[PDB]
Structure formats: C-alpha cells, structure tokens
C-alpha cells in the first residue's frame, strides 16, 4: 500500500489485522494444542482478507509475539478463568486489562500482546455459551484503541504497514 495513514484507516486495519492475527496465532497453535480453539474450519471460521497488505501484518506480528504469547499464554487462561466476565461488563473488564497493560506505555510489542490475549478472553465467553462475542470484542477493541490514543500511535509508527518493517518483517 501507500505510506502515511490516519486514525480513520487505522481503525479498519486494526479490526482486520486483529482478526487475521489472532487467526494465524491460533491456527498454528491448533497443531500443538487446542486451548481456546476456534469453531472448527467452517462458515463460523474467521474469513480474513489476506489479499490486502494487512494480511502479511498479522502473520508477522504472530511471529514476533509467537513465543511470547504461548509463553505467558498457559498462565493467561489460568487467571482468566478466575475472572468469568460477562457481556454486560465485557468492555468494563477489557478496558481495564488494556489500560493496565498500556498503562506503562505504548509499543509494537504491547499492541500485538493486546490482540493475543484479546482473542482468548473473547472465545472464553463465546465457548462458555454467549454465542456472538467476536463482534463485541472487536468493536470494543477498535473503540478502545481509538479512545486510548492507540490508533494515533500506530499511525505515527507507520500504520499497520510497519509490521513488515519489524524483526521477521
């Protein structure tokens, strides 16, 4: 794509890259384990749009945060289970987790991490029985990101197109 980017485009790329990112991370994980696995390869799957430059973004992010994720993933679900959030306070809780994480600051590593645990927390409720949490989580993420000045940060770092300019690029 082209250089530069505004919060407007950042939001769209965020949701897209978010779904694709979590999709890849969990995709490769399905081989090793099945923790918080998706709804099987079907219509309920995560039909991402890898045809765009964003497609490569999620993949890369999953790599730089692959070991890190799985590393603190086992424990992530452990404590997450002790939470047991709801669809009413879903955002009330999520917003807290992120705010507490990015509280120290904002960095490429923090962004990827947010999504890593994001999908987990989402599926946690979805599989629990609250069918239809994917959209809720995604919406809260994009809204929280564009509210926590996150979008602006990403745009300054070179939008989501900067992922290819990272470690494994």
């Amino acid at each position: 794509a082209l250089p530069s980017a505004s919060e407007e485009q950042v939001a769209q790329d965020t949701e897209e890259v978010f779904r694709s990112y979590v999709f890849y991370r969990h995709q490769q994980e399905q081989e090793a384990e099945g923790v918080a696995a998706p709804a099987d390869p079907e219509m309920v799957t995560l039909p991402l749009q890898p045809s765009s430059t964003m497609g490569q973004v999620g993949r890369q992010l999953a790599i730089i945060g692959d070991d890190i994720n799985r590393r603190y993933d086992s424990e992530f679900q452990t404590m997450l289970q002790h939470l047991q959030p709801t669809a009413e306070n879903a955002y009330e809780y999520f917003t807290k987790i992120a705010t507490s994480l990015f509280e120290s600051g904002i960095n490429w590593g923090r962004v990827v991490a947010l999504l890593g645990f994001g999908y987990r927390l989402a599926l946690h409720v979805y599989q629990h029985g609250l069918t239809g949490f994917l959209g809720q989580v995604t919406r809260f993420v994009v809204d929280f990101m564009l509210h926590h000045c996150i979008a602006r940060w990403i745009a300054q770092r070179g939008g989501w197109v900067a992922a290819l300019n990272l470690g494994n690029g």
């Binding site: 603190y72 939470l83 923090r110 991490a113």
Partner: peptide
C-alpha cells in the same frame, strides 16, 4: 477482587518484551 489486580499485574510481561525481541 484479587483477580482484578492480578489479571493486570500479570501483564507486566507481554507488553515490553516483544518490542525488544523484534
């Protein structure tokens, strides 16, 4: 309660270390 601070204190650990491993 203990989870409210724990769930946040546990993420002391996913934000940083990737940025340095990239």
């Amino acid at each position: 309660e203990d989870i409210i601070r724990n769930i946040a204190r546990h993420l002391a650990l996913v934000g940083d270390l990737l940025d340095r491993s990239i």
